[PDB]
Ligand binder design. Structure first.
Ligand code: KKS
Ligand code: MN
Ligand code: MN
Ligand code: MN
Length: 200
């Protein structure tokens, strides 16, 4: 079929807020999303996985972790995760500092993606088009915070997480994997997938 434009895909297939946060960050970093389009789509995908990981997960009135997908989470529920990804650098470190003061967890060397108030740890999310184990070791070797939990997703359903501890239930991780499958399938229908996969 005809070859689409990755920019069109990104704008048509990610929520405008995700697209905007990705666009702003690339621009501040000197990278043009109109040129580095495969990177644009990968940054949107990663940011969306961060949001989906956190979606619907609350700490209840008693302090247990519960899932609330309906529109109204009762007012006394607390969001289970803090989202650090998607914030500019100042706000991201401000949040990381606030967490570390509230909880006493030690401060990471690089910005992680999430903080889990139930498991009391920062999380680094990865999304890859290559093998998860090779991607996992790269991430671990970059940060080696050894308290930051690492959770890797691929576009074909494979996952790898620190100490075989996957944090979330299978239904939440299936939502994420189903979304990644949908992204890959739509890219492939637009003949974008080949360039996207090999671009990592
Ligand atoms: O884990 C994280 N990953 C990524 C990430 C980065 C690049 C790509 C990619 N894919 N193809 N080309 N580039 C994918 C994800 C990111 C995004 C990211 C990290 C560092 C500096 C960035 C500068 C500007 C905008 C985004 C930036 C964050 C992650 O936790
Ligand atoms: Mn809320
Ligand atoms: Mn990040
Ligand atoms: Mn990440």
């Amino acid at each position: 079929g005809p070859l689409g434009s990755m920019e069109d895909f990104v704008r048509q297939c990610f929520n405008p807020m995700i697209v905007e946060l990705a666009e702003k960050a690339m621009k501040e970093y000197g990278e043009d999303p109109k040129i580095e389009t495969n990177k644009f789509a990968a940054i949107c995908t990663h940011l969306e996985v961060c949001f989906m990981y956190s979606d619907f997960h609350f700490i209840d009135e008693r302090g247990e972790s519960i899932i609330v997908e309906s529109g109204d989470p009762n007012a006394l529920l607390k969001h289970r995760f803090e989202i650090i990804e998607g914030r500019d650098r100042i706000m991201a470190w401000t949040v990381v500092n606030s967490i570390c003061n509230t909880t006493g967890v030690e401060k990471p060397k690089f910005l992680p993606d999430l903080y889990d108030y139930k498991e009391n740890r920062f999380i680094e999310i990865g999304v890859t088009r290559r093998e998860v184990h090779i991607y996992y070791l790269e991430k671990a070797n970059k940060i080696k915070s050894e308290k930051t939990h690492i959770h890797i997703f691929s576009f074909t359903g494979e996952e790898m997480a620190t100490k075989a501890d996957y944090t979330l239930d299978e239904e939440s991780r299936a939502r994420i994997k189903t979304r990644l499958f949908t992204i890959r399938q739509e890219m492939a229908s637009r003949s974008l997938w080949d360039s996207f996969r090999q671009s990592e």
